[PDB]
Amino acid sequence: GXGGNDNXG
Amino acid sequence: GXGGNDNXG
Amino acid sequence: GXGGNDNXG
Amino acid sequence: GXGGNDNXG
Amino acid sequence: GXGGNDNXG
Amino acid sequence: GXGGNDNXG
Amino acid sequence: GXGGNDNXG
Amino acid sequence: GXGGNDNXG
Amino acid sequence: GXGGNDNXG
Amino acid sequence: GXGGNDNXG
Amino acid sequence: GXGGNDNXG
Amino acid sequence: GXGGNDNXG
Amino acid sequence: GXGGNDNXG
Amino acid sequence: GXGGNDNXG
Amino acid sequence: GXGGNDNXG
Amino acid sequence: GXGGNDNXG
Amino acid sequence: GXGGNDNXG
Amino acid sequence: GXGGNDNXG
Amino acid sequence: GXGGNDNXG
Amino acid sequence: GXGGNDNXG
Amino acid sequence: GXGGNDNXG
Amino acid sequence: GXGGNDNXG
Amino acid sequence: GXGGNDNXG
Amino acid sequence: GXGGNDNXG
Amino acid sequence: GXGGNDNXG
Amino acid sequence: GXGGNDNXG
Amino acid sequence: GXGGNDNXG
Amino acid sequence: GXGGNDNXG
Amino acid sequence: GXGGNDNXG
Amino acid sequence: GXGGNDNXG
Amino acid sequence: GXGGNDNXG
Amino acid sequence: GXGGNDNXG
Amino acid sequence: GXGGNDNXG
Amino acid sequence: GXGGNDNXG
Amino acid sequence: GXGGNDNXG
Amino acid sequence: GXGGNDNXG
Amino acid sequence: GXGGNDNXG
Amino acid sequence: GXGGNDNXG
Amino acid sequence: GXGGNDNXG
Amino acid sequence: GXGGNDNXG
Amino acid sequence: GXGGNDNXG
Amino acid sequence: GXGGNDNXG
């Protein structure tokens, strides 16, 4: 999501 | 979502 | 997710 | 921190 | 930290 | 740290 | 459905 | 469905 | 389309 | 379209 | 499309 | 589904 | 949250 | 969270 | 989190 | 132009 | 142009 | 954006 | 152009 | 973005 | 991005 | 004829 | 004829 | 004829 | 689509 | 679409 | 698609 | 001169 | 001159 | 001159 | 210009 | 220019 | 230019 | 600049 | 003169 | 710059 | 002159 | 620059 | 002159 | 036309 | 046309 | 045309 995403927290 | 997104918190 | 993503924390 | 950024792109 | 960044791209 | 970065690409 | 769905981003 | 789905990004 | 697209019908 | 688009009908 | 696309119908 | 799915990125 | 059987598709 | 049987597809 | 039988496909 | 063009959507 | 072009979506 | 960006003029 | 082109999506 | 970027002019 | 980038002009 | 053309770029 | 053309690039 | 063409590049 | 007796110049 | 005896100059 | 008696110049 | 130019006639 | 140029006629 | 040029006629 | 202890996130 | 102790994230 | 103790993440 | 530019003074 | 001159284009 | 540019002074 | 000159293109 | 450029002064 | 000259192209 | 000693430079 | 001693440079 | 002693250089 064009920069690193931050999933599951 | 054009910058890293922040999912599940 | 165009930079390293951050999964499961 | 918590999603990366999009600097010049 | 917590997702990388996109510097010039 | 915690995902790498994308410098010029 | 003859596209692609963009979910949570 | 004749595309590709982009989920959590 | 950031999800998959549908080309030529 | 940021989701998948439909091209030529 | 950042997901898989569909080419020529 | 005749594409590819991009999950958590 | 997040309820049921989603075909997120 | 995250409920049911998702066909994330 | 992360619930059920996902066919992430 | 002289920034990459974006065709077929 | 003179930035790579983006065809077939 | 989604058309190539044009930096350093 | 003079940046690599991106065909067949 | 998703069209090649154009840096250092 | 996803079209080759164009650095050092 | 007499200079070429620029079709999609 | 008399200069070539630039088709998709 | 009289200069070649540039098809997909 | 991209249909007919076309001839790229 | 992109239909008929077209000839890219 | 990419259909017909085409001839790339 | 972004299409072939026409010099000295 | 981004398509073949036409020099000295 | 990104397609074949046409020098001295 | 583009002067100081900056840090691109 | 592009001067100082910068650190691209 | 591109001057100082920089460190590409 | 479509002529040469001057970067960082 | 610390650029480049673009003449007749 | 479509002529030569000048980088870092 | 510390660039390059683009003549007749 | 489409002519030769000048890099780092 | 510390570049390269692009003549008739 | 085209008169004198030009340093087209 | 084309007169004198040009240092086209 | 084409007159004198050119140092095309």
CB contact under 8 A, AF2 and AJ9: no
Q: Which residues of U sit within 8 Å Cβ distance of AJ?
A: 8-9
Chains E and I are touching, with contact defined as 3 or more CB–CB pairs separated by less than 8 Å: no
Shortest CA distance to AF7 belongs to which of F7, E3, D3, D1? Answer: F7
The nearest CA of chain E is from the CA of T9 a distance in Å of: 12
Lookup: tokens for AG3: 């001057």
Within 13 A of AN2's CA, how many CA atoms are on the CB side?
16
Lookup: tokens for N9: 């597809």
Nearest residue on chain AI to AH2, judged by CA atoms? AI6
Other Cβ atoms within 10 Å of C9 Cβ, number: 9
Do β-strands E6-7 and W6-7 pair in parallel, antiparallel, or remain unpaired? unpaired
Strands (E), chain AN: none
Nearest residue on chain AL to AJ7, judged by CA atoms? AL7
Hey, is B2 helix, strand or coil?
coil
H/E stretch holding V1 reads none
Question: How many Å from the N-terminal Cα to the C-terminal Cα in chain AH?
Answer: 16
Neighbours of chain K (3+ CB pairs under 8 A): G, H, I, J, L, Q, S, Y, AA
Chain breaks in chain AH (C to N over 2.5 A) after: none
Tokens 């998959």 — which residue? Answer: I4
CB contact under 8 A, K4 and L3: yes
Report the alpha-carbon angle F4-A4-G8, nearest 5: 165
CB contact under 8 A, AD3 and X4: yes
Hey, is R6 helix, strand or coil?
strand
Chains X and AA are touching, with contact defined as 3 or more CB–CB pairs separated by less than 8 Å: yes
Nearest residue on chain AI to AK8, judged by CA atoms? AI8
Shortest CA distance to N4 belongs to which of X1, AH2, AN7, M5? Answer: M5
How many angstroms separate the CA atoms of AA1 and J8, rounded? Answer: 10
Q: Which residues of E sit within 8 Å Cβ distance of T?
A: 8-9
Report the alpha-carbon angle Y3-Y6-Y8, nearest 5: 125
Phi, psi for residue J8 in degrees, rounded to 5:
30, 90
Q: Collect all residues with Cβ–Cβ distance below 8 Å to W8 and sequence separation of at least 6.
A: P7, P8, Q5, Q7, Q8, S7, V7, V8, V9, X7, X8, Y8, Z8
DSSP type of residue E6? E
> Order of strands, edge to edge, in the sheet holding X6-7?
V6-7, W6-7, X6-7
Asked if residues K5 and Q9 have their Cβ atoms less than 8 Å apart, the reply is yes
How many angstroms separate the CA atoms of R4 and S1, rounded? Answer: 11
> Order of strands, edge to edge, in the sheet holding F6-7?
D6-7, E6-7, F6-7
Asked if residues A7 and B8 have their Cβ atoms less than 8 Å apart, the reply is yes
Chains N and AJ are touching, with contact defined as 3 or more CB–CB pairs separated by less than 8 Å: no
Shortest CA distance to D5 belongs to which of R4, H7, AF8? Answer: AF8
Neighbours of chain AM (3+ CB pairs under 8 A): AC, AD, AJ, AK, AL, AO, AP
Other Cβ atoms within 10 Å of AE7 Cβ, number: 15
Tokens 């210009």 — which residue? Answer: AE1
Q: Collect all residues with Cβ–Cβ distance below 8 Å to O5 and sequence separation of at least 6.
A: N5
Q: What does R_g of chain J's alpha carbons equal in angstroms?
A: 7
The nearest CA of chain AP is from the CA of AM5 a distance in Å of: 7
* Method of elucidation: cryo-EM
Q: How far is CA AF9 from CA O8, V9, AN7, in A?
A: 31, 33, 47
Q: Collect all residues with Cβ–Cβ distance below 8 Å to Y4 and sequence separation of at least 6.
A: Z3, Z4, Z5, Z6, AA3, AA4
Lookup: tokens for F3: 């995902």
Phi-psi region of AH4 (alpha: psi -120 to 50; beta: other; left: phi over 0): beta
